Every structure is written in structure tokens, then in C-alpha cells.
A paper describes a structure:
Cyanuric acid hydrolases are members of a protein family containing only themselves and the barbiturase enzymes, they are found only in microorganisms, and are present in approximately 0.3% of sequenced prokaryotic genomes. The enzyme is proposed to catalyze an opening of the s-triazine ring via a nucleophilic serine residue that is activated by a nearby lysine, a mechanistic motif known as a serine-lysine dyad. TrzD is a 370 amino acid, ~39.5 kDa protein that exhibits a complex α/β structure characteristic of the cyanuric acid hydrolase family enzyme. The three structurally homologous domains form a pseudo-three-fold internal symmetry in the TrzD monomer.
The product-bound structure was refined to a resolution of 2.19 Å, with Rwork and Rfree values of 0.15 and 0.20, respectively, yielding high quality electron density maps. An examination of the active site revealed, unexpectedly, the active site lysine residue in domain 2 (Lys163), that in other structures paired with the proposed nucleophilic serine, exhibited a significant displacement out of the active site, and opening a clear channel from the buried active site to the protein surface. Moreover, the difference Fourier map (Fo − Fc) clearly showed electron density corresponding to two CO2 molecules and Lys163 within the TrzD structure. As expected, since CO2 is a co-product, one is located in the active site, while the second one was observed at the interface of domain 2 and 3, proposed here as the exit channel for product release. The CO2 molecule is stabilized by H-bonds with the side chain oxygen of Ser82, Ser233 and Ser349 (~2.9 Å), and the backbone amide nitrogen of Gly350 (3.3 Å), backbone carbonyl oxygen of Gly83 and also with a side chain nitrogen of Arg330. The oxygen atoms of the CO2 molecule were stabilized by two paired H-bonds with the side chains of Arg51 and Glu237 from domain 1 and domain 2, respectively, with additional stabilization by the hydrophobic residue Ile236 backbone amide N and Glu237 backbone amide N. The present structure has an Mg+2 bound and makes 6-contacts with neighboring residues and one with a solvent molecule (2.8 Å). In the TrzD structure uniquely, Lys163, which is conserved in all cyanuric acid hydrolases, was re-oriented toward the surface, opening up an exposed channel between the domain 1 and 2 interface. Here we propose this to be the product exit channel. In silico, carbon dioxide remained bound, thus revealing the exit channel. By this model, domain 2 lysine’s role in catalysis is not limited to activating catalytic serine to open the ring but also guides products towards the exit channel.
Residue numbers in the entry:
A (entry chain A), B (entry chain A), C (entry chain A), D (entry chain A): -5 to 370
Amino acid sequence: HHHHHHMQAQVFRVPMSNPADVSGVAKLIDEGVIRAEEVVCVLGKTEGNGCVNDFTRGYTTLAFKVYFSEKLGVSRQEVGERIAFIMSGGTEGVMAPHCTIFTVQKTDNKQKTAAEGKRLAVQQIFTREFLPEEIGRMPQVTETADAVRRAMREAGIADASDVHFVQVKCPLLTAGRMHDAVERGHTVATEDTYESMGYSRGASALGIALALGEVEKANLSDEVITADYSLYSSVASTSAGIELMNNEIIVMGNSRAWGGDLVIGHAEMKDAIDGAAVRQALRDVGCCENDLPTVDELGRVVNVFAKAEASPDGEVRNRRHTMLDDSDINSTRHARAVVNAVIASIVGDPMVYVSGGSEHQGPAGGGPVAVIARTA
Amino acid sequence: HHHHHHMQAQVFRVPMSNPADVSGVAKLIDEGVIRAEEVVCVLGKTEGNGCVNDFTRGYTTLAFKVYFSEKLGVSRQEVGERIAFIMSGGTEGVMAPHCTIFTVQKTDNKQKTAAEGKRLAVQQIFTREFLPEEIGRMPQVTETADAVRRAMREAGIADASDVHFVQVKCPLLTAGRMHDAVERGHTVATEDTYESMGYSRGASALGIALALGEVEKANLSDEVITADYSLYSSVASTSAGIELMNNEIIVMGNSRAWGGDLVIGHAEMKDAIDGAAVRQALRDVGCCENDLPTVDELGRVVNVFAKAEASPDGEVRNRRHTMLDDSDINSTRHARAVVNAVIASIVGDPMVYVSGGSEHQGPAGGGPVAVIARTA
Amino acid sequence: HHHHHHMQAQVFRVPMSNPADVSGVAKLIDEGVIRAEEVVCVLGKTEGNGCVNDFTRGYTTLAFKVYFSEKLGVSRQEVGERIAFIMSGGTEGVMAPHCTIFTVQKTDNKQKTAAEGKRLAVQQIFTREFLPEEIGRMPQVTETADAVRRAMREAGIADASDVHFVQVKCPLLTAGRMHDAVERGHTVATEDTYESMGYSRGASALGIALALGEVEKANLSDEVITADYSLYSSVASTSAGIELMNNEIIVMGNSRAWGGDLVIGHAEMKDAIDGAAVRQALRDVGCCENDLPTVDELGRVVNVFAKAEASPDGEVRNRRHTMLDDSDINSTRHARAVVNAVIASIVGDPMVYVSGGSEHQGPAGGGPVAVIARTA
Amino acid sequence: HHHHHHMQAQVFRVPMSNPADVSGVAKLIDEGVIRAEEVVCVLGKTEGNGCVNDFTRGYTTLAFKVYFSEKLGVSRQEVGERIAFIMSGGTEGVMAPHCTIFTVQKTDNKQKTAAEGKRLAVQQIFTREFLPEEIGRMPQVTETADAVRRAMREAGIADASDVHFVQVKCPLLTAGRMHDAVERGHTVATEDTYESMGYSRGASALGIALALGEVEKANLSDEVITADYSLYSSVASTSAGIELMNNEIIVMGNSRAWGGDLVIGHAEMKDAIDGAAVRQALRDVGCCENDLPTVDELGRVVNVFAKAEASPDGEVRNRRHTMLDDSDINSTRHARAVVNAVIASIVGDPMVYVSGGSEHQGPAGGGPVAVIARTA
Ligand SMILES: [Mg+2]
Ligand SMILES: [Mg+2]
Ligand SMILES: [Mg+2]
Ligand SMILES: [Mg+2]
């Protein structure tokens, strides 16, 4: 009598022709490949500049809320409370705009499984609203950690070693939110909006590290954040956006309690040109058995997800880089172009998720790379 | 009684801390590693934007003319007539600013050679001055071709199959030069300066193709240039600059008439993420015997030289890219970041020469990649 | 027995905090200052880069269609067929993002007028859909002209001398639309998307000139467009956008058949720093009686509307400018920053509409400046 | 028996076609309009991006050192110790690249004066070298102040009310200089290079304010700098550059001890569109007797010199501006385009000096505007 599962994850990498193009998703729903009701996350690469004044993130979010609210017959607020819309801007270099759709299929009666291994589990969860004076600070850290521990448990992911990627959409500090904080008698972690994105990304990432036991609580405080880059998560991927003031989190790992045919793995890029780490992540998901991946192996890849940054020590493999003191082009623009190019050249596909700004996500100048792949 | 050589090439990849930093070169001359009198080409990657208003190209040129004129006790004009100063702007992504010094050692009495194979030959040559109405048109094509055929012969490179890289510094059309042409009763190939860079690069590249028998003269005319991308050289690398109105050419290949321990090889990148072509060029120079290069093999690499461009069909491996309709960041900026990232991740060194704009240099969206490497 | 009017225009300059901020408009409707049913045009300054990949134009359009469709209880398609959403990107320099709401109040029984003069008349009209091979060419010219003549008549604007500003939203050629045209056996006026914006703006502007008798039909053909800048309209203001393939036109002038207290006037800026033309337009609407406008006079200004461009001869008042060969910053970005700065410094308010790219709109390097002002 | 003078200043506004174009200056020397030996300052507007990676500043400096060293028969080091080469990058909007040449003619026997008034006095002076840990801090403040007080005295400028413009070239902190400071056991005022430019500009400006009695010493400390913008000089204009580690200062005012026909005046722009302050500065130098300047009056203007910045409160005349959270275009780029446009439209000439970044120079969001003009 076969083994059985109540839960199954599906993942779909969908090309987008511009920030408002929901048609690849509508096609899959129209064709019954996915059910709108089972979507839990839309993870976008939108082709704005990926920095402060990137409005394609909110544009794409709005475009998807309109589609899903009308497809599901609910309000835009409800759909927003039901699906995490996580839009990472900046599609530099060859990086192809797209979105990844995550679905969870829950069956009241179990459906039989064919292989005994663990399979992809994903669980979305939202934190409480933060006040602006909490952004970039320990209340964002610990609330995120609490949410991550909870999502793990509810997904039936056994322990932190089975978590391979935690994606967060986190707030940033606009000038208005800063004023709000001051007018109420508080300070903010920084008075520059662009810098606030790294603070928000960093604090969220350390929450993940805290939740997975990768850092000790007693080594964390406000003054560590964006400062002590010996502290980090190996699976954290955080993306700052203008819209919300809470954190939207999707935990991704493997679990025996899930059926289906997707698994996930990860490695740690030690820097932005560490293609060996890329091949190792592929290998862990059975997509690079030898030195170089084969075409069949690469056809199992659903998508690759990575974080990129300009090495803050100014160097890559003891060569000076120019990404940090370039007044025309922000460092994250450079960094995303690089890391997507490295991954694209290994998996032969520029349509992969690469998000900039990896404060406390991997080592400095590096970041996590995760692969979701089919088992056959 | 050993075989013998009159000619020997040396090549030195020198870090630069900013566009005026000649100190790495001064160090090698001060230490007697090279002789100022035997330098024939300084090939720079200067950290300006690499497009029209990139003044680091002329800055670096000026800085080197001052150093060499004073080191050689000649005027800046004479040093400029003696050394080709070929400055390719744009050091995007991880690309590390640097210059490559080429020297030719001529000995009246031959010096004995140890291995019988062909060795790196390089030969600099300048064309006549062009009028602005000749830029981007058949007189730039045929003069370049004549110069390339001559440089080959004088270098003792047996035939086109032994040429692996032809580097050109070519003019561009400023608004003043355009007016000059009109006031004299002529037209120009384009009235936009940035577009004129592709016309100048393209015409120069087809001269190289003509010289090496890669295209037929009867298939060339003005209307082909930047238009028919089925016509191209596999070894051409051309870089437009504001300074001169002639073409400065350095032909690089292998020859039995040269001693030393450097060889060169090349492959054709079919697109900007074609790392297999990169590994093939390494393999041809004995630096990638198996699937992945080893650390010893990579230590033989002196430098890698490549051309990069945004695929003009809008696509990379059937994925849409955004490089061509990005009003904030020029396509060549994107493309250089990509191709240097791909090469850097394979050879483990971001200090490599990657020049943007590959009209008629490789297939559309692609370009040549050449490696100069030590034989042991 | 007083004179009487069936028609009255209102205009409201509304600050926007970001591209999706419809709240200033919702406030005026909630308060009953305007009636949603009487809005005919939303003219936006959205804070994207104002060039090809400016997605705030469509974002803002989408945000307003959602608000109005839900306020009016119609579909987004119907609201789009009822209101012209004309979004001009690029808010450089001090230029403050905002929108201008235009309303037309029609009364079946006339309402009495107090002053006998002409008053602001505005009339929206849409052309037919264009095929991509018509963009930038005589069918866009003549269809626009037909639409302008019709809007004038239906508005009861007596003749071209009473037209002071014709605002158009016109298409641009994406790579897909170009392919469509070729696959059907046709050519396009240009194969570059950014250049296609000037072609679309130019053709639309000459339609306006044709309609108002400012150019002769026999002097127009495809080869004139973006080429012969002695041909132009003094009241045309055209803005290219990615969304539609028709032209949306709003004609603005003065008419005895309209009541209310708004008038409009215009002058022609001879170049981008022609503040005397700005003061002349103010004077024509009674807002600059002496050399310098007073605070009361400036308080009558509802908004100012202007076109800006980088002088294509490379010069402003016989000084070289750098706007055209700047690879980091598009010329229209520079030009909008300049012209808004000049106007803002004269009217003491950076919240004014300045749209880039004035092909055939005013003389080369110049453009129209119109003022809508209250009569007291 | 006439009054008499030992000292006379000349000023020449010279167009430049590119950063290396010294020919307008060579022409004036060749023609004997100026004597190379009497040049004390070359004040440039060079057409780089005016931020961190603007290499046209050093390029232009190098180009002028080569010309003058060879014209004067001295070394480049000596010419650099003899002339202040003050290169302000960024020629945005219509701003025309150019340099202003300042000369001082000293005569052992006095030359008779025709008018009794004060005339332009200018005095160059260099501070000591700073260590990087002194940049942006009180030792830069007080050394600058000492140098300013000394230059004033040696120029015979009676008191601070006769000083109208103090131009400084000040250092910035590269990553290397920061490391130097840390390795020696010290901190730096900031670890970002771009931010270090404002710290260096700010500290230098407060030195000027200290020297002229515009701020009290007891209100200054390190923590005030870039923080308390109620502290500022009304005549300070400071420009950060990569080259030196000292400050090069030129004090400009009026003095009875100077002959000639140039005077200088200044006003304080309260914000970036304060054209009334521009007209007031003109009026003080007899170039705007009525509301609007006349053509003859404007022909007396040799040049105008101003500082520009993006209002750090996010607003201009209670309108939101976008200059500070624009990741594509630095705020100083925007601000320079604006202020040069405002001045150009008033004096009818875009060739004027406008330098970005006015920390402690005028009120926040504003800056000084000075005019040097002929008396007839
Ligand atoms: Mg990291
Ligand atoms: Mg090519
Ligand atoms: Mg025009
Ligand atoms: Mg200030």
C-alpha cells in the first residue's frame, strides 16, 4: 500500500513581455494547468531599475491583483492577503523578465506517492506591520524569525537543514515614513531611502538566520545590521519594495510530507563569479552529475534563484571592481547583470531570478543560489 | 644546431588604479622586464562609460604619451606614431581596469628556439587619415584590408588561418567632422555620433574580413555595413575613439618565424553567454585539456580578449533581453558586463579585455574570444 | 437679459505622491468639486525616465482607469474610450509630479455668463487605430488633422487663431509592432523604438499644423518628418506612449460659446531658455501686465504646458550644449529639466507640465508654452 | 595727481570644445591678451558627470599643466604649485563647457587709476596637506579659515563685507585613503566616497564662514558638518576632486588697492529657482538697473558663478522634487541643470559656472551667486 501525501507544490516559470503582462499566467489558468485558488506566491523579475524609484514592482503587483481579484471574485485587498506578490526589480544584462508562480495543492484525502524521498514544500506567511522606526532593527529581525519558524513547522519541514531558500518582500523607508517616525519621537536606522533598502533586506535576512540557527541571538543587535558581515544566512533572499510595511515570506524546502516531483537545493556563491557553486546546487538536485551539466539535466530545471551584490571590499578575486563608486549606474545594477550572466551561461537560460542586495545573505560579495528542479 | 628566431613577442597584463595610472608599466620598465623602445601597443580597458562621451580613453592615451615621450626622449607626436594606444572604454560588472602591453624584440642575430612550433607574432600598422565622408564606408574597408594584409606579411604570418585576433582603434564622427564633410559637398554614413561608432567599427571589421578572405569583395558596398550581419570576420575586434581619423591596427597570430613562449588562439562566441567557445579557445592554447580548466592551466593565461554586444534580434537563446530599449543604460554597457562576467567566471579572473560593439565581428549577438597564453 | 452658455471647462492641477496616487482626484470628486462623469482628460507628469522604458505612464493610466471605472460603474475599456489618459513621463530637475484634470460641463439649458469674452473650450477626440507602417508617416498626419479640425468645430472654436494648445498621446513602435509590419509586407519609418517616438510625435504635430493651416499639404510627405524643421505647429504638444495605436487628442482654445472663468493663451519659446516667451504667454492671459509678474497675477495660473527639446544644431544662443551626445542621460531628460526650471523660476511654481521631444512643435530647439488662467 | 594701483585682476571666460581643449587659452596668450606668468587660477566646467567617477576633472587639469609647464618652461609640479586648477565637473542641461582664467598683474611702480571705487581683488592660496582622517572635520575647517584670512589680508581686501566669492578645490576620500586612515589607527568621517565629497565641501565651506565671521567657532564641531544647515557661508563655493589632499583656495572680492575695470558682487539664492537673487547680484555690479537686465548691461558680464543643490527637505516652494531618490541620475546632476538654466535664462548665456553640492554654502537647497562684471 503506497505512501501518501496531502500536500504538493507546483512551480511555473512564466515569460513576461512587460510589467503588466499577466497573459502567460492567464493562459496556464485558462488551460487548467494551475488553479487560481491554489497560487500562494508570484515571484517577479520586473524590468525597472531595481533600486528606489523602480515603479514596475508596484505596477506588476497591481496588474496581478487586478487579474486574480477578478479571476477569484474577491477584492484586491483579500487577494493581497492571500497571495504574496514579491517583485524584484532590475533585469540587467541578459536577464529575461518573467515571474514564477508557486501553487500549493491540498487534498483532504491523501494522494499516493511514487518515490519515497522528500519533495518541495513551500509555505507563505506574513508578519505584522512594522513601524518605520522598527525597519532595519531587531523587531524586524525577531518578527521575521518567528514567522520563518512558524512557516517551517506548518509546512512540515523537519529542520533547518531541509530549508533551501527563504524569499522575503520587505519594506523600505520613504521620506514620509521617516518623518512619521520623528514626529512620533523616534529615530530611524538611516535617513537615506536607498540605504534603508539594505537595512530592511539585512534585518529580514538575519531573522532568517536566527530562525534557522545560523546565528546566535546574543550576537545580534541593531549595530550589527549592515555592519558585521560575518553574520548571515545561507538560504536568505530578501527584496525591498515601496508598497507594504510588513514582511511577506515564503519558505521553501523539502519534506517527506509532500508529494509531487519537484525538489529544491542550494549552494552558497562565495562571490559573483562562483559558477562552481552554481554547478553544486544543480548537482544536489540531480542536474549536474558530472563536471558540466547535460542538456537533459538542464531541462529538469524549473528555475534558479540567486542573490547578487557588489563586493563591499571593492574587490573580486583580488581584482578591483568599479561597481561601488559608479555614479551613473548603481552597484546592484552591475551585480545583478553579473550573477545572472554567470548562471545563464551555466544553465543555458537567461530567464532566471537574480535579485540584488545581499546584506547578510551569503558571505560579503556573495549570496545563495537555489534550484528548483523536476526529479526526472 | 638549434632552430633560430629574429623576432619575439612579449605581453604584460598590468592593473590600473585609474585612467592615468602608468605606474604598473613604469615598474616593469624600471625593473627591465620590458624595454620602452620595444613597446608597440598599449591596449587599455579604461573605466569611462565606453560610449560617446567617454573621456578616459583620451585621458589614458595622454597619460601614456607623456610617460613614454619622456622615457624615450621623443615628442608626444613621435611616440604616437611609434606606439598604438588603443583604449577601450567601459569596465562594467566585475571587469577590472587594466592595460595590456605588447612588445616586439628584434635581434639582428637570431636567438635559438627550444620548441619548433609557431609562436605569437604581432605587428602594428596605421592606415592613412580618413576624411569623415569615408568613415563607415568602403574606403575605410579597403584601406584597413590593405593594412592588414601588409601587417600579416611583414610579421611573417603564413596565412589567414594563423591570424587569431586583429585589434583596431578606429575613428568616430563628431558633429564638427560631419559639418566639415557637408561643407565640402559630401554626405556622411550617419548623422548620429553614437551610431557612427558602429559604422566605423563595422567597416574596419569588414576590412579585416576582406583581408583574411572571410568575405568576398563583390559582396561588399556601403549599404551592407551595419546591415548584413551574415558578413563578418571571426578574428576582428574594433574599438571606436574620438582622437584620430586614421585606423591603428595590431595583427596578432602565430608564426614559425617567431620565438618566445607565447601562443594565441581564438574561438567564436555564438552569443554573449557562450562559455563553451571560451573553453574551446583556452583548449586551443593548451589551457583546457578536459571539460573544466585547472588552476595550473589558467595560470598560463596572460589575458583574454573578446567582443560583446546586445543581440540585435532582441533575444538570447530565445529569451527576450532588455539591453536595446533601455534609455538609462546603453546596450554596450550591458553587453560588456555580461561577456566579461562569463569569461571571468571561467578563467577565474575579472581582469580581461572585453570591448563592446561587435558589428561584423562574429555572428550577430556574438563575437570573437582570443587567448594569449604561455606554453608551459 | 444676460448672455448665455451651454458649455463650461474646468481645470484642476493635482499633486501626485507617486504614479499610482489618485487620491488628490478622489478628494475633489468626493468633495463634489468635479463630477467624474464630466472628466474628459487626465494629463499626467509621471516620474519615470520619460523615454522608451518608462512604465510609470502605463502604471498611472492603469491606476486611473481602475479608479474611474469603479467610480463610474463602467468597464476599464469604456472609461478608456471616454477619457483621454495622456501621461508624459520624465519629471527631471525640480519638476513636480502631478496631473491636470480637464472637465466639460454641458447644460441643456444655458447658464448665464457675466463677461462677454471668449472662454476656455476643450474637446477630446480619438483617431482610428494605426497600423505600425503608418506611424511617423502621412496617414498619421492626415488622420490627426481630420480629428483636429473636427474637435475644433464640435467645440465651437471659431478658427485656428483661437486654438492655443493641442495635446496628443501618440503611439510608438515596439519591436513586435515592427515585426508585424514586415511580416505583412511593409516597412516602418524607423527600426529604433526611441527614434520612433520622435517620428510619431512629429507626424502628429504636422497633422495639427495641417489642420490649423500652419503648413501646406503640398509641402508634406514622409521624407519631411523629423527632417524639415522649418515645418511646424506653434500650438502642438505631442507625447509618445507604449499603450495605444491610435492618437488621443485634446484641442484647447477660447470660444464665445463657452462660459466659465478660464482662458488660455500661448507663445512660442524660440529656445529652451526663452523666458520672455513665457512672460508673453502669461501677459496674453492677463497674468503679466508689467515686466515681471506679480504674486496676484501668478495666483491666477492654473497650470503652464510646454514642450522642451535639446537644440538639434548642438547649440543654445551660440553656445555648445552636451545634451545630444550624452550616453548616460538622454537629451529629452536634460531638456525637460531645463524648460521646467525656466518656467518654474518665472511663475514661482515647479508643478508645471513640461513634455520632451518637440519635433515639428515650435522651431527647432524650441516649443510652445501655453497658460490656462483664471480671469480674476 | 591721479590715484594709483600696484595690483590689477583680469578674468577671461574661454569656451572649451572638450576636456583637453586648451586652445582658447593658448590663443589669448599667443595674442598677448594674458601673460602665462600672471595666471593664478583656471576654473573649469568639465563635461564629465560631476560626481565620484568624473575623470574629466583630472584630464583637464593634466592638459593644462602640460600646456602651462611647456609655455612657462617649468615642471608640471611647479606649475601645479603656482596655479590653482579648480575643475568642477558636470555640464548638465544647457551648461556650456568652458574655463575661466584669472590673472593678477603686479606692477612695481603703480599704474594710475581712473575711477576711485574698489576693484576686483583675487588671491590664490593653498593649505597644507590633510590626512584622510582630517577630511570633513575641524582641521579642514580651521586650516581653510586660516588660509582665507591670510589670502584676504595679502590681497588687501579690507574686511569680510568686501569678499563676494571664495572658491575651493578640496579632496575626497577614496577607498585607499580610508584604508590608510584605518591602518594608522584612525576613523574617517564617512566610509562612502560620494558622501565624503559633501563632507569635504561642507568642512571647507565652514572654514570660509569661520574666516569671514559668518559662524562662531564655538558652534562648530565635527558633528555639525553636513548636519546643521543653519550654519553656512554666503560666499563659499567648494568643489571636491580626486587629485590633491590639500585645499586650493582663491579669494575674490573688491579692494581700493586694486585698479582695473572689473568688480564682483553676490547674492544668496534661497533655492534653485531664485532668479530674483540672480538679478540682485547683477544689480550690485551695475548690470540690472531696472526690473529686467538690458542687452548692454548683460554684455558687461564676464561670468557668473553659483552653487546648486537638491533641496535636502525634498521640496522646492512646497512642491515635492524627485532629485534625491533618483537612482539613475544623481541629485547634483539635476541641481546643476536647474540652476544653470535659471541663470542662463536671465543673463541670456548658458556659458556660466554652476557647481553642485552646496553643503553649508547658502541656505539648504540654495547657494551663492556671484557676478564678475566690467564697470562700463
Ligand atoms: Mg552577501
Ligand atoms: Mg557580432
Ligand atoms: Mg521644436
Ligand atoms: Mg546650501
